[PDB]
Amino acid sequence: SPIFGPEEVNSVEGNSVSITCYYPPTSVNRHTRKYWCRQGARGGCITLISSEGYVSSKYAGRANLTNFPENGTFVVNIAQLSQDDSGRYKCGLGINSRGLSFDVSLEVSQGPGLLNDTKVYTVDLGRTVTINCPFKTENAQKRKSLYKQIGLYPVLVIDSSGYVNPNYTGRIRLDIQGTGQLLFSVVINQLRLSDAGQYLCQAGDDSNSNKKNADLQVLKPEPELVYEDLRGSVTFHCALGPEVANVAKFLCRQSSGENCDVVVNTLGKRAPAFEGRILLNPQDKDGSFSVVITGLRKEDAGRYLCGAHSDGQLQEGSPIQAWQLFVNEESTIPRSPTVVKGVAGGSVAVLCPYNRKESKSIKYWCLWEGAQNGRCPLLVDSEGWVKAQYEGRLSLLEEPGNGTFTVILNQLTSRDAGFYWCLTNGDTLWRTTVEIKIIEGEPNLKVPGNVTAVLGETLKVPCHFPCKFSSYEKYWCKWNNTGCQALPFVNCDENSRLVSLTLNLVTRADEGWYWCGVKQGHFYGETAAVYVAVEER
Amino acid sequence: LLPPPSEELALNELVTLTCLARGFSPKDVLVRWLQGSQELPREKYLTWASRQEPSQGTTTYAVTSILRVAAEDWKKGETFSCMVGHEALPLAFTQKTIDRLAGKPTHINVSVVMAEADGTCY
Amino acid sequence: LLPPPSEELALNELVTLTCLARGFSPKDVLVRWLQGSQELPREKYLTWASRQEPSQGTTTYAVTSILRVAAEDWKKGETFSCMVGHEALPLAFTQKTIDRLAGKPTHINVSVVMAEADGTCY
Amino acid sequence: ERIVLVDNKCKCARITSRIIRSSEDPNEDIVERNIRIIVPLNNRENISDPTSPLRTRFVYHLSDLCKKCDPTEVELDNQIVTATQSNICDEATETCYTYDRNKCYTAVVPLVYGGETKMVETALTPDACYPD
């Protein structure tokens, strides 16, 4: 069930193949036995090659199997394929009679032999192709017909003077570089899946009904395998060519009854189920862009298609890419609160988890705008840069450490509601999102407004707390760009209130912001904030 | 009249029963208990007052009661009854009865899969 | 670790147990026997050398050993154990155990009891 | 066979359930419950080597399989409080019938090295006991 690979695999005789299977990287799963077995009929599921050194008699000289523990993948190569190797197979871990497997289907087709009197062209679904047809030195004043044997009718639906089909309209031309020599040509724009088959070309006729064949193959794209887990994130890379760099591109998800459903557009569409947790980036000089989706749920798994059109929908005759996604759900990403509530004037504190062996990185904090496309302006980083309008009410702290860091945002308003992202500079990124709702009530801690100061004398500021915070620790701060650390000047005099602050000569170095807080040693809590100016007389 | 919780049943002590009446219009009611046909004396059970319930306009009232019996009397097959008297009932009384085999299942399948066929999945 | 053959149990004088190790890549290995939970002296069993087995891919090795014990201790219910130490094992040793009830059993007794199948699982 | 209630790996027992919205009488429907027991025929009673012979009796109490005693978090008013979830978890101490793929099981054996003896440690399940 956590095991994933390519569902269907095709090749021809004599060729090779390479199959990859994925597993969770836990230490039991790296050291256990890996196997490739052929699930035939009549009970058993006989093994063909294994990880401990077993190679069967039929696979001698043809195959091997390599385990890569840091990827969590293992690869199987099989050379010199035949037509007796078509059947249903299985990847796996451990003992065959349990079910830690994945089903793979493999079909091998018969190749070409002794019918090679055609010049074939292969082309991607939704691109251009040419069909060359040698004009000769007498057959100019006839019809230059082109049949396609629907059944065995000669179906002329293309003529080289405009006598065309309403089916094949709007995309067929000819261009003249003939008049005596041995070529003319026809360019076919925006091919479909429907336009396959064998073409009996001609260019004029000398009456023996002499025939020329020029067949084409149109192929649908191969999906790339992506392996992610619950509460993680994914990126797709949509890398169509520079020919369509001025078209509106998109990304659907395939459903059961041949139905893409649009997740994003370039003209400003979105599903409601992806609000707060999707990005789309501006495309480069090559016309290549990326789509980021965070907070992966269980039902996100399936086939995805990225394409291009004038409107932003899956229409036939458009170039596509593909992917197949698997959500693991035996994850090791720690769970977290998704919603965090607060009241106007109060504080919040959210915990953001990263990977433990990537602790030497730099940390960031977003704000998902979501207006046009999806966008993360930064608000604060671990280097010591904060935004302009978030001055005095934002900080990022590296406690509790070891899996987690902490960011504190107070002086809340009703317009601070939104979705927020936490980022690192590590190798593979989890991006976790949290929603801040603003509810009604009043703050727990209570401080006055903004204080003045006379020309050089003692200041004193109080800060209240209820008896639910009596079990906890009390502190102050002075806020600067690198966070805040506590002061030695406080009294914490009264047994259930009034943790004070004394500044016994007002210099210019105190004119900033100060905080009043609550912590259980490592975990942080509520916060208030005040400013202290200094006036003239 | 509600059956006992299974957690209480799997401990071999006293098990508890619950009676409930709701939706009646004047707040005057009588609740009595029975075991088989014998009325139990009213020092063996606890019954609350009769309060009104949140609803849509038409004011109505509710009442509960409990009774704890021994597990051997329950497991042998002795039945119990809750009986309710009101003025708007045409015959002025109502009965309910409970014992074992009340919510007993209707179908049970047992399959013993032998060796040489072990084919479970993850 | 293999049980004794069937025809040695009738003559009731001594029995023999076999310990086979298979499929390991360097040719260095150790074999030690226990009775119950006490190590036996080295001069009571016989171990051969490690040799290379026929190839099904990568080259691997194998080794054997036998131990002869009294036929009364096999029928009391004493247990014997075989230990193999190798360079590639996790904690450098591993073991297997056998006694009279496990191996050519001639009898399989198993009794499964399920208590409360209809029981409000929360 | 739709929703998992219990997936226990000390006893290797699994309980699922599904509302089967049956065809006939389409305004009533049944509740099905599936239980799966896998019984090992070669394990001991205690998981050490010479304990007692192979286990021949296996007992399953569904009031113990459905038990829930780890504390949870509940938002009552505008608060986070911690609560328990069961009436009976006055206390590992349970006996396990099978192993578990994600846990080591070791032993200690004394062997001789010419002079004294040692306290050599032995892995009983070799896949799960690499130091990593």
Ligand SMILES: *[C@@H]1O[C@H](CO)[C@@H](O[C@@H]2O[C@H](CO)[C@@H](O[C@@H]3O[C@H](CO)[C@@H](O)[C@H](O)[C@@H]3O)[C@H](O)[C@H]2NC(C)=O)[C@H](O)[C@H]1NC(C)=O
């Ligand atoms: C099931 O078997 C295990 C394994 O034998 C039992 O655990 C072990 O019990 C012994 C005796 O109680 C412990 O030995 C003690 O060692 C300490 C030194 O650490 C020493 O101070 C004592 O005098 C005694 O020698 C041993 O530590 C313990 N644990 C292991 C091996 O991990 C277990 O009690 C058995 N359980 C049942 C229910 O039978």
Ligand SMILES: *[C@@H]1O[C@H](CO)[C@@H](O[C@@H]2O[C@H](CO)[C@@H](O)[C@H](O)[C@H]2NC(C)=O)[C@H](O)[C@H]1NC(C)=O
């Ligand atoms: C993880 O998988 C990648 C495949 O994307 C491996 O990359 C290839 O590794 C082989 C070595 O066997 C090289 O010959 C190839 O050049 C690599 N690149 C590609 C694009 O195929 C990678 O080796 C795996 N990870 C580890 C740690 O081995």
Ligand SMILES: *[C@@H]1O[C@H](CO)[C@@H](O)[C@H](O)[C@H]1NC(C)=O
């Ligand atoms: C064995 O594996 C290697 C990978 O290093 C691969 O290049 C080679 O083709 C394989 N041999 C076969 C398939 O015979």
Ligand SMILES: *[C@@H]1O[C@H](CO)[C@@H](O)[C@H](O)[C@H]1NC(C)=O
């Ligand atoms: C980090 O977390 C792990 C797992 O909780 C713990 O074993 C380790 O000691 C922690 N490190 C520190 C420095 O606290």
Ligand SMILES: *[C@@H]1O[C@H](CO)[C@@H](O)[C@H](O)[C@H]1NC(C)=O
């Ligand atoms: C605090 O009061 C001073 C006094 O002029 C003012 O300049 C400052 O903007 C005030 N800050 C807030 C957050 O109200």
